[PDB]
């Protein structure tokens, strides 16, 4: 694949010997061998450079063409303001590496300048750029954090960073970069059940989409957080799925067959003195949250509801019973369960 230093030097010596017999000393310390060794070292360094470039190109060349940037780890940097008590009475010099720090336990991060700076005599305040010593988001200190210089002259009135630092970043892994590319490529797909479902889901107010396929017809079931499908949202879904549907195939949009389950419960309780309106409304809110959390294909298992209601409190809640709920309410994929009228009786 590539030559190396010893091989390059050996071939150079062989070619030199073949070209002419006027040179035969190739021992260490020889001018000619030193020159060939230097040329060999330069060529080996160029080989390593080519290896680095090709290793970068293998994992970044193709995806970069599609406007996808891999996030490199960076040191957080930004501008800071240094104010003087008076206009400078001589040219002040701030050497590279001059450290800036903060007087808090929340931000022990240390910032330093990477270049020399000069403040003219006429100046009264000068802005400089500082770089966080540590890569990562730990250097993204907020506004007003950097407020100290460890090797500044007494003429300084105050140090202050005028804006929060945000350039600190963590390295994006290769697998995440591939995942984003592959996601984008899949999103380019069209005229399929998967693509239709994706394009419906991209709509802002759509929470859940089931696509049911028939020969020559497609029907899309959608619902919002509440289980409802507004006419306006229906029209939006239709307009967005004009681009997605196959040619010569009919597409229809319908609401999800919502099923509001009314639950009247009789809760036995131990602490009779804690019986009141607030506990009732708390239990009812828990039941309503449980019922509304169910997704499209989720069946209402009554035993899990009983588990939840008893897990509201292990000792207070004594026993529960329902008259409406006699057996588990199985629903199809296109039929979501939602919260109906809820009543709780404390016993």
């Amino acid at each position: 694949k590539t030559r190396k230093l010893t091989n390059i030097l050996s071939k150079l010596i062989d070619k030199t010997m073949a070209g002419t017999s006027k040179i035969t000393d190739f021992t260490p310390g020889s001018a000619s061998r030193s020159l060939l060794e230097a040329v060999s070292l330069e060529i080996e360094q160029f080989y390593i450079l080519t290896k680095e470039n090709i290793d970068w190109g293998i994992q970044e060349g193709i995806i970069e063409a599609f406007d996808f940037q891999k996030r490199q780890s960076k040191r957080a940097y930004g501008d800071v303001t240094i104010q003087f008590y008076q206009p400078l009475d001589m040219r002040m010099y701030i050497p590279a590496g001059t450290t800036f720090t903060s007087t808090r336990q929340e931000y022990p991060q240390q910032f330093e300048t990477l270049v020399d700076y000069y403040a003219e005599p006429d100046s009264t305040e000068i802005v400089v750029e500082v770089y966080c010593k540590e890569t990562g988001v730990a250097g993204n200190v907020p506004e007003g954090t950097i407020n100290t210089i460890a090797s500044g002259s007494s003429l300084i009135r105050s140090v202050n960073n005028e804006y929060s630092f945000n350039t600190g970043t963590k390295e994006e892994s290769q697998e995440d970069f591939k995942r984003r590319f592959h996601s984008f490529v899949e999103s380019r797909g069209r005229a399929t059940n998967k693509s239709v479902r994706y394009g419906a889901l991209q709509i802002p107010d759509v929470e859940g989409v089931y696509v049911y396929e028939e020969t020559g017809h497609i029907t899309v079931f959608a619902h919002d957080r509440n289980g409802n499908l507004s006419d306006t949202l229906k029209e939006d879904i239709i307009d967005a799925l004009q681009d997605y549907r196959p040619s010569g195939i009919m597409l229809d949009v319908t609401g999800v067959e919502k099923e509001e389950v009314n639950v009247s419960a009789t809760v036995t309780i131990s602490n009779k003195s804690r019986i009141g309106d607030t506990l009732q409304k708390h239990i009812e809110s828990v039941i309503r949250s449980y019922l509304n959390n169910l997704k499209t294909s989720d069946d209402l298992i009554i035993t899990d509801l009983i588990q939840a209601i008893m897990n509201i409190d292990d000792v207070l809640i004594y026993d529960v019973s329902f008259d409406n709920l006699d057996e588990n309410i199985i629903v199809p994929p296109q039929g979501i369960i939602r919260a109906g009228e809820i009543k709780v009786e404390l016993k």
Partner: peptide, 10 residues
């Protein structure tokens, strides 16, 4: 010098 290091300090 540090001017070149500014291009890629990391």
């Amino acid at each position: 010098t540090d001017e070149e290091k500014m291009k890629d300090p990391e």
